[PDB]
Amino acid sequence: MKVRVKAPCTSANLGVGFDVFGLCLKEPYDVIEVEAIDDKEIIIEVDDKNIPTDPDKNVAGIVAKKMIDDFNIGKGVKITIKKGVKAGSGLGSSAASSAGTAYAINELFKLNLDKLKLVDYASYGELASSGAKHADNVAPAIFGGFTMVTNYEPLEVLHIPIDFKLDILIAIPNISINTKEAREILPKAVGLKDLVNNVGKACGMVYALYNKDKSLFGRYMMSDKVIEPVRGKLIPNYFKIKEEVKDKVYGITISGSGPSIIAFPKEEFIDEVENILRDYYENTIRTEVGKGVEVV
Amino acid sequence: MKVRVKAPCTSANLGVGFDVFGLCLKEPYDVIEVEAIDDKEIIIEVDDKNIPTDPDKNVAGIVAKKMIDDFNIGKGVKITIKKGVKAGSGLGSSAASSAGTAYAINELFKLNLDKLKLVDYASYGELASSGAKHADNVAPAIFGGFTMVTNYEPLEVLHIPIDFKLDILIAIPNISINTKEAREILPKAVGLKDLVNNVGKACGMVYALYNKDKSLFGRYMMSDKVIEPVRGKLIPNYFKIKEEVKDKVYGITISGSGPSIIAFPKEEFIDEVENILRDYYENTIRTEVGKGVEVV
Numbered sequence: 001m002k003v004r005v006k007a008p009c010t011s012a013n014l015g016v017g018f019d020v021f022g023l024c025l026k027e028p029y030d031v032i033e034v035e036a037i038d039d040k041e042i043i044i045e046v047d048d049k050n051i052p053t054d055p056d057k058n059v060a061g062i063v064a065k066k067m068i069d070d071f072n073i074g075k076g077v078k079i080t081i082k083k084g085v086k087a088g089s090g091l092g093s094s095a096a097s098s099a100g101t102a103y104a105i106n107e108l109f110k111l112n113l114d115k116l117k118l119v120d121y122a123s124y125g126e127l128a129s130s131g132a133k134h135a136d137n138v139a140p141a142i143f144g145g146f147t148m149v150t151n152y153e154p155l156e157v158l159h160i161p162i163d164f165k166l167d168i169l170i171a172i173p174n175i176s177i178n179t180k181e182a183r184e185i186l187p188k189a190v191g192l193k194d195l196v197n198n199v200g201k202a203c204g205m206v207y208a209l210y211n212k213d214k215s216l217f218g219r220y221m222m223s224d225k226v227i228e229p230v231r232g233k234l235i236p237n238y239f240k241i242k243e244e245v246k247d248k249v250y251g252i253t254i255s256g257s258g259p260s261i262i263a264f265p266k267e268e269f270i271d272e273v274e275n276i277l278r279d280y281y282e283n284t285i286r287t288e289v290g291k292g293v294e295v296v
Numbered sequence: 297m298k299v300r301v302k303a304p305c306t307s308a309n310l311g312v313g314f315d316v317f318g319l320c321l322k323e324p325y326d327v328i329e330v331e332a333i334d335d336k337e338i339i340i341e342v343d344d345k346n347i348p349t350d351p352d353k354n355v356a357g358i359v360a361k362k363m364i365d366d367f368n369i370g371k372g373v374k375i376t377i378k379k380g381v382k383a384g385s386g387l388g389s390s391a392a393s394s395a396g397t398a399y400a401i402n403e404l405f406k407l408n409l410d411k412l413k414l415v416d417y418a419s420y421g422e423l424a425s426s427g428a429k430h431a432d433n434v435a436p437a438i439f440g441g442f443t444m445v446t447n448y449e450p451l452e453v454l455h456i457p458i459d460f461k462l463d464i465l466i467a468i469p470n471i472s473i474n475t476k477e478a479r480e481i482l483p484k485a486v487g488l489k490d491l492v493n494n495v496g497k498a499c500g501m502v503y504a505l506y507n508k509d510k511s512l513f514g515r516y517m518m519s520d521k522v523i524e525p526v527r528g529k530l531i532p533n534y535f536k537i538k539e540e541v542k543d544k545v546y547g548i549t550i551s552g553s554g555p556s557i558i559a560f561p562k563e564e565f566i567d568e569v570e571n572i573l574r575d576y577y578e579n580t581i582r583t584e585v586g587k588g589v590e591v592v
C-alpha cells in the first residue's frame with residue numbers, strides 16, 4: 001500500500017512575473033515514497049541531514065497531516081524523501097516536497113482531487129514553514145509547464161502548457177538565501193512607471209508563450225528594474241555572467257529568490273553557455289520544462 | 297487623389313491594463329476623407345466647431361505635416377472630418393482622427409507603411425493634444441481587436457485578434473473630467489502587493505483572451521485597486537452602477553481616463569443593462585469589438 005513519486009524543482013518570478021509566474025523544471029527533483037501504515041502517526045525519513053524529520057517541521061509531514069485530518073483517513077504514513085536540491089537555493093526545494101506529498105496522498109488514498117486543490121494543500125506546507133502560503137512554486141510543481149498564480153483568497157492558478165522545446169540551464173551557487181532574507185531586501189514601494197513596465201512586459205511574456213516566441217519571452221523577462229537589480233547583488237558574478245552570455249541566450253535571470261540563475265540558451269550556443277556558467281559555478285545542470293509531479 | 301475611411305473609437309486601460317491595454321470599438325467612428333491638393337496647404341474641415349481647424353492644432357493636421365514632410369509628397373491636403381463622438385470623454389476621439397488620418401495618408405499616397413509604423417506616426421498627433429506620445433488608443437484604432445503597448449522608443453505593440461463576439465455597451469456621462477488633473481491625483485508609487493495583483497490579473501486577461509473566456513477576462517479587468525478606486529470617485533454613480541449590473545455583465549470598468557464607462561454585458565441581459573445605463577446617463581452605445589480603420 002504505497003506510492004512513489006518524482007516531484008520537480010521549479011523556477012518562480014522569472015523577472016517581471018514576481019510572485020505570479022512559475023516554470024516547472026524536469027530536473028532536479030525529489031523522489032518521495034509514501035506508505036500507508038496502521039500506526040496513526042507520521043514518520044518521515046530524509047537523505048539530507050539539514051532537513052527536519054519532525055512531522056511538524058518537515059513540510060511533507062505538515063501536508064500529510066492536514067490531508068489525513070481533512071479526509072478523516074485512518075492509516076498514518078511513512079514518508080521517505082530523497083532530496084533533489086538543497087533548501088535556500090531558489091529552486092523550490094521545499095515546494096517539491098510539499099507538492100509531491102499532496103500528489104502522493106491523493107494517489108495513495110484515491111481522493112480524486114483536482115490539481116488546484118493539490119496546489120492549495122501543498123501551499124500549507126509552504127506557509128507553516130515560511131509564514132506565507134505562497135503557491136508560485138507549488139503551482140508549477142503540480143501543473144507542469146508555465147503557471148500564473150493570479151489570486152490567493154481563493155487560490156486561482158492559470159496553466160499554460162509548453163509544448164515546444166525550451167532548453168534550460170541552471171547555475172547553483174554554494175551560498176543560500178533563506179526566503180526570509182529574501183523579502184526584507186524587497187522594496188516596500190514601487191513607482192507607477194515600474195508597475196506599468198512590469199505589467200506590460202509580463203503580459204508580453206504570456207503573448208510570447210502563445211506565439212511560441214522565445215526571443216520575446218526572454219527579452220521581456222529581463223526587463224525588471226524593481227526587484228532583480230536588488231537581488232542580483234546577492235549573487236557573485238551575476239551581472240558579469242549576464243553580460244558574458246548576452247547574445248547567446250534568449251534570456252537569463254534569477255530563479256525564485258535566488259541564488260540560483262536560470263538561463264534559456266539559444267540552440268546554437270547551448271554548450272558554450274553551459275561552460276561559461278560552469279566556469280563560475282560548478283553545480284550547473286542542463287534541463288528543460290517539466291510536466292509536474294508524476295508517479296514513478 | 298483622395299480616400300474615404302472610418303477611424304473607430306477605442307477604450308484604453310481596461311482596469312489592470314492601465315497604460316498598456318487597448319480595445320478597438322466598432323462604433324462610434326470618425327468618418328474621414330482626404331484630398332491631395334497641389335497648393336502646399338493643410339485644409340482641415342471638421343464639423344463640431346469645437347475642434348481646432350488650425351492645421352497646427354488639429355491632430356489630423358499634425359499627422360499630416362510630420363508625415364507629408366518625411367515622404368516629401370510635396371503637397372498639401374483637404375481633410376474632411378466627421379466626428380464620431382465628443383472629445384475628453386475617454387473614447388480615443390483624438391486617436392480616431394490621428395490614426396484615421398495616418399491610415400488614409402498611407403492608402404491614398406501610394407505609401408506601403410506598416411501598421412506599427414502607422415501607429416508610430418499617429419502617436420505624434422496625441423503628443424500635441426494631450427502631452428506624451430500615448431500609443432494605447434492609437435494602436436487598437438489601427439490594429440483592431442485588443443492591443444498591448446509593451447514598450448516605447450522603440451514603440452512595441454502586441455496585437456491579439458478578437459475572433460469571437462464580444463458585445464460592448466458604452467455609457468457617456470454629460471460631465472467633463474480634466475484628463476490632466478485625472479493624472480496628478482494618481483498615486484506616484486504603489487505597494488508591492490498591488491504590483492503583484494495587477495501583473496497577475498493583467499496576465500490572466502491575456503490568458504482569458506486566448507481561451508476565449510469572457511467571464512475570466514471581465515472579472516480580472518475589475519480588480520484594479522491602484523487607479524480605478526481614485527478615478528471612479530469623479531464619475532457620478534459609477535460605483536453604484538457597477539454593483540447593480542454585477543451579475544449581468546462579464547465586467548464593467550472606466551474607459552480611458554473617463555468619464556466614459558465600458559461594459560461587457562452577458563447575452564441574456566444586454567437590453568436590461570443598456571436600459572440601466574441609459575437611466576443613469578443618457579448617452580449609451582451598443583457596439584462590439586472593431587477591426588480598426590478601414591476604407592469606408
Ligand SMILES: Nc1ncnc2c1ncn2[C@@H]1O[C@H](COP(=O)(O)OP(=O)(O)OP(O)(O)=S)[C@@H](O)[C@H]1O
Nearest residue numbers: 354355383384385386388389390393425426552553
Ligand atoms: N481631430 C480631432 N478630434 C478630436 N479632438 C481633437 C482633434 N484635433 C485636436 N483635438 C483636440 O485635442 C483634445 C482632445 O483629446 P483628449 O482631451 O485627450 O480626448 P480624447 O482623445 O477623446 O480622450 P483620451 O485621451 O483618449 S481618454 C481637445 O482639446 C481637442 O480640441
Ligand SMILES: Nc1ncnc2c1ncn2[C@@H]1O[C@H](COP(=O)(O)OP(=O)(O)O)[C@@H](O)[C@H]1O
Nearest residue numbers: 051058059087088090092093094095097178179
Ligand atoms: N521536505 C523538505 N524539503 C526541503 N526543505 C524543507 C523540507 N521540510 C522542511 N524544509 C524547510 O523549509 C525551508 C526551505 O525553504 P526556503 O529557504 O524558502 O527554500 P526552498 O526554496 O527550498 O523552499 C528550510 O528551513 C527547510 O529545512
Ligand SMILES: CC[C@H](C)[C@H](N)C(=O)O
Nearest residue numbers: 012013019179182256257
Ligand atoms: C518563496 C517566495 C517566492 C519564490 C517569491 N516569488 C519570492 O521571490 O520571494
Ligand SMILES: CC[C@H](C)[C@H](N)C(=O)O
Nearest residue numbers: 308315430432433552553
Ligand atoms: C486613454 C488612456 C490614457 C492614455 C491614460 N492611460 C490615462 O488613463 O490617462
Ligand SMILES: [Mg+2]
Nearest residue numbers: 388389390391
Ligand atoms: Mg486621445
